[PDB]
Design a protein around this ligand. Structure first.
Ligand SMILES: [Cl-]
Ligand SMILES: [Cl-]
Ligand SMILES: [Mg+2]
Length: 220
């Protein structure tokens, strides 16, 4: 499975094609695309490749929902081609089944790479309301890739499996109730997030309490 000898990426395409709806004064529907992102995530190291997708790519094109899956597959292949072979993933796990065929067709030059689907709940969409990603995506004027470390300094003291489990609880809790999750994640008036970190600096005891509360929020 995960946390072995091989490089694994999760790929989430959920947030690539995003639109806002508006009812005009004339009573018609406008559907305006807004910038999206592909999340490509290494659960062992915490590395996130955030590929920001600028609305220009949609041009005057149709069925943008299906096309978006192909755009995602194109970008994953482009990233793989830009990496030395030793940094290429051995397995790619797609969070949505619609990515299986587009990725299969785009990765035919990489017979070493195993593609599979998943039933895991890994809502990277929660990141769109984490200010550090949200504004970056909103304000982009062209496509670009940005690297992050989603585990902050956790791996100094906990294993990759432990870090992944904490991250998933954070994302799922933010997804199900953003406002309440943010309160849970700020236990003290003194609680801060370092400028180069994504998540707060909490004591070991604070994390125990937070992990239980996040889980309960998800169960609710
Ligand atoms: Cl799908
Ligand atoms: Cl890019
Ligand atoms: Mg390395």
């Amino acid at each position: 499975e995960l946390f072995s000898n091989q490089i694994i990426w999760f790929v989430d395409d959920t947030n690539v094609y995003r639109v806002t709806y508006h009812k005009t004064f004339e009573g018609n529907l406008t559907t305006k695309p807004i910038n999206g992102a592909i999340f490509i995530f290494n659960p062992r190291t915490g590395q996130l490749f955030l590929k920001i997708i600028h609305t220009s790519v949609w041009a005057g094109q149709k069925r943008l929902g299906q096309l978006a899956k192909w755009k995602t597959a194109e970008e994953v292949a482009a990233l793989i081609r830009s990496l030395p072979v030793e940094e290429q993933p051995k397995q790619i796990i797609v969070t949505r089944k619609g990515m299986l065929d587009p990725l299969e067709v785009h990765l035919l030059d990489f017979p070493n790479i195993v593609i599979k689907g998943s039933e895991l709940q890994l809502p990277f969409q929660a990141c769109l309301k984490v200010e550090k990603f949200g504004d970056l995506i909103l304000k982009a004027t062209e496509p670009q890739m940005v690297l992050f470390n989603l585990y902050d300094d956790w791996l100094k003291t906990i294993s990759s499996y432990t870090a992944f489990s904490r991250l998933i609880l954070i994302l799922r809790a933010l997804h199900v109730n953003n406002d309440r999750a943010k309160v849970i994640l700020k236990p003290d008036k003194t609680t801060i997030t370092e400028p180069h970190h994504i998540w707060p600096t909490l004591t070991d005891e604070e994390w125990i309490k937070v992990e239980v509360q996040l889980k309960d929020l998800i169960l609710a």
